[PDB]
Tab-separated table of C-alpha atoms and ligand atoms in Angstrom:
chain	number	residue	atom	x	y	z
A	1	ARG	CA	18.269	-32.710	129.098
A	2	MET	CA	20.561	-31.366	126.584
A	3	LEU	CA	24.212	-32.637	126.288
A	4	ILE	CA	26.367	-30.161	128.499
A	5	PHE	CA	29.670	-31.551	129.735
A	6	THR	CA	29.867	-32.595	133.381
A	7	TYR	CA	32.797	-34.748	134.978
A	8	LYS	CA	30.231	-37.480	135.416
A	9	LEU	CA	30.078	-37.329	131.303
A	10	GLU	CA	33.280	-37.189	131.103
A	11	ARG	CA	34.296	-40.288	133.169
A	12	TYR	CA	31.643	-41.777	131.682
A	13	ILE	CA	33.557	-41.519	128.135
A	14	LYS	CA	37.110	-42.174	129.715
A	15	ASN	CA	35.592	-45.123	131.457
A	16	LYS	CA	32.790	-46.618	129.504
A	17	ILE	CA	33.489	-45.464	125.878
A	18	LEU	CA	37.090	-44.699	125.046
A	19	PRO	CA	38.633	-48.291	126.056
A	20	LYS	CA	35.911	-49.768	123.907
A	21	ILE	CA	37.171	-47.353	120.740
A	22	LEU	CA	40.598	-46.606	121.056
A	23	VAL	CA	43.181	-48.627	119.227
A	24	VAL	CA	45.628	-48.385	123.018
A	25	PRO	CA	43.295	-47.871	125.804
A	26	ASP	CA	46.132	-47.107	127.926
A	27	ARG	CA	45.736	-43.530	129.428
A	28	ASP	CA	49.563	-42.621	128.884
A	29	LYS	CA	48.890	-43.572	124.670
A	30	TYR	CA	45.956	-41.062	124.235
A	31	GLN	CA	45.812	-37.498	124.214
A	32	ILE	CA	42.325	-35.394	124.111
A	33	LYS	CA	42.408	-32.471	121.668
A	34	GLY	CA	39.746	-29.425	120.669
A	35	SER	CA	37.186	-28.539	122.392
A	36	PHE	CA	36.656	-31.169	124.738
A	37	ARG	CA	40.230	-30.890	125.905
A	38	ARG	CA	38.839	-27.172	126.889
A	39	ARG	CA	35.340	-29.142	128.106
A	40	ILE	CA	33.256	-26.662	126.596
A	41	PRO	CA	29.983	-26.423	128.243
A	42	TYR	CA	27.438	-27.549	125.184
A	43	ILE	CA	29.533	-30.554	123.996
A	44	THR	CA	30.465	-30.870	120.121
A	45	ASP	CA	32.581	-33.677	119.333
A	46	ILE	CA	35.608	-35.669	120.719
A	47	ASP	CA	38.787	-35.387	119.228
A	48	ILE	CA	41.811	-37.979	119.937
A	49	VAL	CA	45.290	-38.643	119.630
A	50	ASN	CA	45.960	-42.203	119.755
A	51	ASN	CA	49.802	-42.862	119.818
A	52	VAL	CA	49.798	-46.402	119.462
A	53	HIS	CA	53.385	-47.448	118.071
A	54	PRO	CA	55.397	-49.543	119.128
A	55	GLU	CA	52.711	-51.336	120.718
A	56	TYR	CA	51.204	-51.517	116.782
A	57	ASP	CA	52.479	-50.424	113.828
A	58	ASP	CA	52.512	-51.483	110.070
A	59	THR	CA	52.085	-55.334	110.089
A	60	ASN	CA	49.074	-55.563	113.337
A	61	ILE	CA	47.477	-52.392	112.765
A	62	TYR	CA	45.154	-53.770	110.206
A	63	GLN	CA	43.995	-56.909	112.053
A	64	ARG	CA	43.064	-54.334	115.468
A	65	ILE	CA	41.021	-52.561	113.488
A	66	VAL	CA	39.143	-55.798	112.130
A	67	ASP	CA	38.900	-56.478	115.575
A	68	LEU	CA	37.765	-53.095	116.861
A	69	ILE	CA	34.641	-53.047	113.737
A	70	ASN	CA	33.707	-57.334	114.587
A	71	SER	CA	33.354	-55.909	118.368
A	72	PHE	CA	31.163	-53.323	117.308
A	73	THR	CA	28.575	-55.183	114.824
A	74	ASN	CA	25.661	-55.716	117.478
A	75	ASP	CA	26.841	-52.874	119.412
A	76	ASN	CA	23.981	-50.292	118.529
A	77	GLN	CA	25.508	-47.248	120.726
A	78	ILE	CA	29.165	-47.128	118.583
A	79	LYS	CA	29.204	-47.310	114.882
A	80	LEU	CA	32.789	-46.630	112.885
A	81	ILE	CA	31.540	-45.238	110.141
A	82	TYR	CA	34.784	-44.363	107.897
A	83	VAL	CA	38.465	-45.314	108.546
A	84	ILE	CA	40.389	-42.587	106.895
A	85	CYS	CA	43.858	-43.759	105.399
A	86	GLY	CA	45.577	-43.273	102.432
A	87	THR	CA	44.777	-40.649	99.146
A	88	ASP	CA	43.817	-40.665	95.133
A	89	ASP	CA	46.631	-38.670	93.799
A	90	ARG	CA	44.742	-38.117	90.530
A	91	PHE	CA	42.742	-35.503	92.877
A	92	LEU	CA	46.183	-34.199	93.603
A	93	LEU	CA	45.869	-31.026	91.686
A	94	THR	CA	48.203	-28.145	91.315
A	95	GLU	CA	45.491	-25.988	90.951
A	96	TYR	CA	46.260	-24.514	87.108
A	97	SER	CA	44.186	-23.958	85.010
A	98	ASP	CA	45.272	-26.953	82.813
A	99	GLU	CA	45.253	-29.447	86.244
A	100	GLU	CA	41.106	-29.064	86.716
A	101	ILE	CA	40.684	-30.359	83.103
A	102	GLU	CA	42.435	-33.899	83.575
A	103	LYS	CA	40.049	-34.752	86.208
A	104	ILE	CA	37.038	-33.831	85.163
A	105	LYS	CA	36.573	-37.451	83.150
A	106	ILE	CA	36.854	-39.155	87.054
A	107	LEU	CA	33.894	-36.328	88.149
A	108	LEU	CA	30.040	-36.386	87.933
A	109	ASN	CA	28.987	-33.268	88.574
A	110	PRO	CA	31.524	-30.460	87.511
A	111	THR	CA	28.910	-27.774	87.216
A	112	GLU	CA	29.264	-26.891	90.791
A	113	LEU	CA	32.823	-26.772	89.913
A	114	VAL	CA	32.547	-24.549	87.228
A	115	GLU	CA	29.833	-22.582	88.768
A	116	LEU	CA	32.646	-21.825	91.353
A	117	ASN	CA	35.179	-21.185	88.751
A	118	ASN	CA	34.917	-17.909	89.055
A	119	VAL	CA	37.027	-16.552	89.790
A	120	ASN	CA	42.544	-17.389	93.452
A	121	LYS	CA	41.223	-17.755	96.772
A	122	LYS	CA	38.600	-19.632	95.502
A	123	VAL	CA	40.881	-23.233	95.416
A	124	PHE	CA	38.169	-23.714	99.113
A	125	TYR	CA	35.239	-24.644	97.028
A	126	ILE	CA	37.104	-26.796	94.728
A	127	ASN	CA	39.018	-28.774	97.504
A	128	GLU	CA	35.748	-29.005	98.976
A	129	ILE	CA	34.467	-30.994	96.298
A	130	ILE	CA	37.297	-33.434	95.973
A	131	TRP	CA	38.338	-33.776	99.464
A	132	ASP	CA	36.471	-36.596	99.704
A	133	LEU	CA	38.051	-38.204	96.355
A	134	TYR	CA	41.440	-37.226	97.846
A	135	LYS	CA	41.763	-38.811	101.035
A	136	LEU	CA	40.577	-42.510	101.198
A	137	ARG	CA	37.163	-43.009	103.237
A	138	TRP	CA	36.953	-46.775	104.209
A	139	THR	CA	33.635	-47.844	104.828
A	140	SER	CA	33.627	-51.198	107.529
A	141	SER	CA	33.066	-53.744	104.772
A	142	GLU	CA	35.472	-52.264	102.524
A	143	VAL	CA	37.829	-52.638	105.505
A	144	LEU	CA	36.951	-56.001	106.502
A	145	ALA	CA	37.254	-56.943	102.707
A	146	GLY	CA	40.335	-55.599	103.057
A	147	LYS	CA	40.023	-53.887	99.549
A	148	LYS	CA	38.005	-50.200	98.096
A	149	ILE	CA	37.591	-49.435	94.243
A	150	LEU	CA	38.123	-45.914	93.035
A	151	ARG	CA	36.740	-44.207	90.544
A	152	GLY	CA	36.801	-45.427	87.180
A	153	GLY	CA	37.270	-48.514	88.598
A	154	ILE	CA	40.364	-48.163	89.938
A	155	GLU	CA	41.777	-51.252	92.433
A	156	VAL	CA	43.012	-50.356	96.047
A	157	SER	CA	43.966	-52.797	99.305
A	158	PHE	CA	43.822	-51.698	102.577
A	159	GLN	CA	47.323	-53.457	103.612
A	160	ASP	CA	49.578	-51.134	100.840
A	161	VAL	CA	47.741	-47.760	102.220
A	162	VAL	CA	48.746	-48.413	105.617
A	163	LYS	CA	52.314	-49.450	104.597
A	164	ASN	CA	52.366	-46.319	102.599
A	165	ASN	CA	51.246	-44.406	105.534
A	166	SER	CA	52.207	-43.378	109.085
A	167	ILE	CA	48.418	-42.204	110.501
A	168	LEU	CA	45.039	-43.331	110.073
A	169	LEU	CA	41.719	-41.753	111.199
A	170	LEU	CA	38.638	-43.419	112.877
A	171	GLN	CA	35.398	-41.713	112.616
A	172	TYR	CA	33.216	-42.869	115.328
A	173	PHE	CA	29.583	-41.885	115.856
A	174	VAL	CA	28.309	-42.738	119.549
A	175	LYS	CA	25.106	-42.498	121.119
A	176	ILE	CA	26.193	-41.066	124.607
A	177	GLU	CA	22.645	-40.326	125.808
A	178	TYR	CA	19.775	-39.075	123.233
A	179	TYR	CA	21.725	-38.757	119.864
A	180	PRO	CA	24.942	-39.652	118.304
A	181	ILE	CA	28.273	-37.600	118.714
A	182	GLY	CA	31.309	-38.152	116.979
A	183	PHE	CA	34.519	-39.193	118.295
A	184	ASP	CA	37.643	-38.452	115.754
A	185	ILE	CA	40.510	-40.619	116.657
A	186	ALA	CA	43.919	-39.974	114.435
A	187	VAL	CA	45.864	-43.007	115.423
A	188	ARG	CA	49.612	-42.915	115.072
A	189	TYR	CA	50.789	-46.367	113.762
A	190	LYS	CA	54.719	-45.151	112.956
A	191	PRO	CA	57.097	-42.989	115.017
A	192	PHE	CA	44.945	-23.052	109.845
A	193	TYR	CA	43.236	-21.878	106.717
A	194	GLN	CA	39.988	-20.680	109.130
A	195	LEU	CA	42.866	-18.169	111.278
A	196	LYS	CA	42.643	-15.871	108.586
A	197	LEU	CA	39.829	-13.259	108.522
A	198	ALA	CA	40.480	-12.499	104.798
A	199	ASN	CA	39.192	-15.849	103.879
A	200	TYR	CA	35.855	-14.987	105.561
A	201	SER	CA	32.851	-12.896	104.000
A	202	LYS	CA	30.559	-11.452	106.946
A	203	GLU	CA	30.237	-15.160	108.942
A	204	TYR	CA	30.420	-12.713	112.467
A	205	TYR	CA	30.593	-15.673	114.776
A	206	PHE	CA	33.001	-17.897	112.752
A	207	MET	CA	35.269	-14.829	112.497
A	208	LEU	CA	35.485	-14.533	116.249
A	209	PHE	CA	37.516	-17.703	116.423
A	210	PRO	CA	40.393	-16.100	114.518
A	211	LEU	CA	40.234	-13.563	117.235
A	212	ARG	CA	40.422	-15.831	120.181
A	213	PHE	CA	43.657	-17.220	118.582
A	214	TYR	CA	44.921	-13.447	118.257
A	215	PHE	CA	44.219	-12.519	122.050
A	216	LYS	CA	44.690	-16.668	123.457
A	217	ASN	CA	47.614	-14.947	125.381
A	218	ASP	CA	45.332	-12.320	126.682
A	219	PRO	CA	43.850	-13.456	129.851
A	220	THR	CA	40.885	-10.636	129.949
A	221	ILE	CA	40.173	-11.306	126.480
A	222	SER	CA	40.385	-14.946	125.804
A	223	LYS	CA	38.166	-14.882	128.701
A	224	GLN	CA	35.530	-12.884	126.981
A	225	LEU	CA	35.974	-14.494	123.654
A	226	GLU	CA	35.600	-18.007	125.412
A	227	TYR	CA	32.233	-17.113	127.253
A	228	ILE	CA	30.730	-14.937	123.943
A	229	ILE	CA	31.454	-18.313	121.523
A	230	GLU	CA	31.492	-21.316	123.789
A	231	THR	CA	28.459	-19.902	126.411
A	232	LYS	CA	26.584	-17.010	124.980
A	233	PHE	CA	26.270	-18.765	121.358
A	234	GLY	CA	27.610	-22.205	122.419
A	235	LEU	CA	24.232	-24.066	121.744
A	236	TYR	CA	23.985	-22.013	117.925
A	237	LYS	CA	27.535	-23.992	116.935
A	238	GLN	CA	26.082	-27.201	118.928
A	239	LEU	CA	22.811	-27.057	116.760
A	240	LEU	CA	24.891	-26.900	113.435
A	241	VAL	CA	27.241	-29.612	114.576
A	242	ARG	CA	24.248	-31.842	115.140
A	243	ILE	CA	22.993	-30.959	112.104
A	244	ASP	CA	25.931	-31.736	110.719
A	245	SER	CA	25.982	-35.318	112.295
A	246	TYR	CA	22.779	-36.116	110.516
A	247	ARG	CA	24.034	-34.977	107.134
A	248	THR	CA	27.440	-36.896	107.629
A	249	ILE	CA	25.647	-40.207	108.934
A	250	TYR	CA	22.981	-40.061	105.779
A	251	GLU	CA	24.950	-39.519	103.789
A	252	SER	CA	27.239	-42.607	104.434
A	253	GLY	CA	24.181	-44.951	104.136
A	254	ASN	CA	24.042	-45.476	107.994
A	255	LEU	CA	21.105	-43.225	109.297
A	256	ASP	CA	18.166	-45.994	110.133
A	257	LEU	CA	14.799	-44.101	110.890
A	258	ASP	CA	15.272	-44.645	114.786
A	259	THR	CA	18.061	-42.528	114.906
A	260	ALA	CA	17.046	-39.763	112.591
A	261	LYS	CA	14.397	-39.246	115.209
A	262	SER	CA	16.091	-39.129	117.822
A	263	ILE	CA	18.485	-36.466	116.262
A	264	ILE	CA	15.300	-34.337	114.959
A	265	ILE	CA	13.352	-34.477	118.569
A	266	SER	CA	16.340	-33.034	120.218
A	267	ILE	CA	16.219	-30.607	117.718
A	268	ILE	CA	13.006	-29.362	118.024
A	269	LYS	CA	13.361	-29.016	121.850
A	270	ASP	CA	16.604	-27.134	121.944
A	271	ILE	CA	15.879	-24.997	118.898
A	272	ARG	CA	13.455	-22.825	120.873
A	273	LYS	CA	16.287	-21.771	123.090
A	274	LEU	CA	17.633	-20.170	120.402
A	275	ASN	CA	16.595	-16.141	118.865
A	276	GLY	CA	15.815	-15.316	115.497
A	277	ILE	CA	14.906	-18.491	114.195
A	278	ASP	CA	12.212	-18.898	111.553
A	279	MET	CA	10.141	-20.927	113.529
A	280	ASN	CA	8.134	-21.679	110.240
A	281	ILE	CA	10.983	-24.094	109.421
A	282	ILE	CA	10.067	-25.994	112.989
A	283	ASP	CA	6.120	-26.524	111.996
A	284	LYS	CA	7.279	-27.532	108.537
A	285	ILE	CA	9.362	-30.391	110.347
A	286	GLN	CA	6.506	-31.398	112.519
A	287	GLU	CA	4.486	-31.547	109.208
A	288	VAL	CA	6.271	-34.300	107.679
A	289	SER	CA	7.310	-36.402	110.892
A	290	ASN	CA	2.822	-36.417	110.535
A	291	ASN	CA	2.468	-37.215	106.971
A	292	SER	CA	5.598	-39.085	105.759
A	293	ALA	CA	6.860	-42.352	106.407
A	294	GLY	CA	10.270	-44.322	106.567
A	295	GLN	CA	12.713	-43.297	104.191
A	296	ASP	CA	11.114	-40.541	102.801
A	297	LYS	CA	10.463	-38.966	106.177
A	298	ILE	CA	14.510	-39.412	106.738
A	299	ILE	CA	15.113	-37.763	103.362
A	300	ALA	CA	12.420	-34.719	103.629
A	301	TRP	CA	14.367	-34.033	107.336
A	302	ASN	CA	17.289	-33.717	105.524
A	303	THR	CA	15.713	-31.047	102.902
A	304	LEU	CA	14.672	-29.408	106.115
A	305	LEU	CA	17.536	-29.220	108.203
A	306	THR	CA	19.643	-27.647	105.284
A	307	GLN	CA	17.053	-24.929	105.543
A	308	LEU	CA	17.716	-24.411	109.351
A	309	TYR	CA	21.086	-24.692	109.253
A	310	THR	CA	21.263	-21.414	107.037
A	311	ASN	CA	19.225	-20.135	109.335
A	312	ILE	CA	20.914	-20.912	112.008
A	313	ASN	CA	23.961	-19.529	110.764
A	314	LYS	CA	22.162	-16.580	109.578
A	315	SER	CA	20.781	-15.610	113.260
A	316	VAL	CA	23.816	-16.232	115.093
A	317	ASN	CA	25.844	-14.484	112.510
A	318	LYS	CA	23.884	-11.265	112.911
A	319	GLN	CA	24.094	-11.249	116.755
A	320	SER	CA	27.870	-11.525	116.740
A	321	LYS	CA	28.435	-9.129	114.286
A	322	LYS	CA	29.639	-6.378	117.943
A	323	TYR	CA	31.424	-8.551	119.276
A	324	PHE	CA	33.609	-8.729	115.937
A	325	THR	CA	33.663	-5.329	115.464
A	326	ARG	CA	34.716	-4.549	119.143
A	327	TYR	CA	37.330	-6.998	119.103
A	328	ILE	CA	38.535	-5.881	116.272
A	329	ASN	CA	39.009	-2.585	116.688
A	330	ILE	CA	40.920	-3.780	119.679
A	331	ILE	CA	43.220	-4.293	117.163
A	332	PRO	CA	45.404	-1.890	115.368
A	333	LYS	CA	44.347	-1.103	111.630
A	334	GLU	CA	47.807	-2.085	110.168
A	335	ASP	CA	47.502	-5.551	111.646
A	336	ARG	CA	44.064	-5.913	111.925
A	337	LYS	CA	43.932	-6.399	107.527
A	338	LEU	CA	46.085	-10.067	107.962
A	339	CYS	CA	44.418	-11.426	111.070
A	340	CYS	CA	46.004	-13.757	112.332
A	341	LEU	CA	49.025	-15.182	110.942
B	401	MG	MG1	27.851	-51.083	115.884
B	402	MN	MN1	36.253	-30.838	117.914
B	403	MN	MN1	36.167	-33.577	115.207
């Protein structure tokens, strides 16, 4: 039932999906990156680099994206949510006490902003707010229209953006089996922070990731860490990503009831395989599915998935603390300070 890696699935992806969503389908012109390249058992998403020059360049890449978009209009399995290309430099801060001020005029909610101006490495929640504003995320209709309106009413055109950039990102969601899966395609048409243990509070599961990088060239330890992260706790991570998929699709304004329901159904089934979960959250989700309807249901679910998200994090971090302490103690105290760069 669950979406697990198999070669039947990989072949289906490479044969039936990729030729449809890639700018250049030729196998020699694309590379699979990230977790899918490692063929992790609990598939989360697919990351791909598409090197399309000289086949495609500044002068014809737009029309090829238009072709892709149009080919999907009547395809219920594939949706191109965002085309990411360009930046809005007005949100290019210099992180100076005076920089910030000059941007508030174009923000709506700077309470959240001032509610975390408190206090040098917390630029993380600053960029966490303005990232979507700095990086231009084009919708399909904005791409087809060929123009985009920015905050404050500033006008921008897609052709200008491609001419001033070397790469664009296609953000797809694809219904592979029972629910949507993210496909991120980095399209190159012209010729990191989460690795520091210092930037973590006590998210012990995610703090294993810097450790895995540290021990990447140690066979015995890298196998153990890979097993722990990807198999023992693999489903915890997959469920977090799957909840992010709901959120992302919903926030973009493209989640219909049928898709929301398929996601919620898959989560209810799989959540029972986990340990330490407040199953009351699950019961609350079922009661929504019973006494709400249409959009109100989608919204109520979104709200409840947020609690569930928190709960899953809490649980996996708790069950992970010992594996962290174990492997961190393998590193010398002098070096364990600034793991791992
Ligand atoms: Mg579609
Ligand atoms: Mn990935
Ligand atoms: Mn991705």
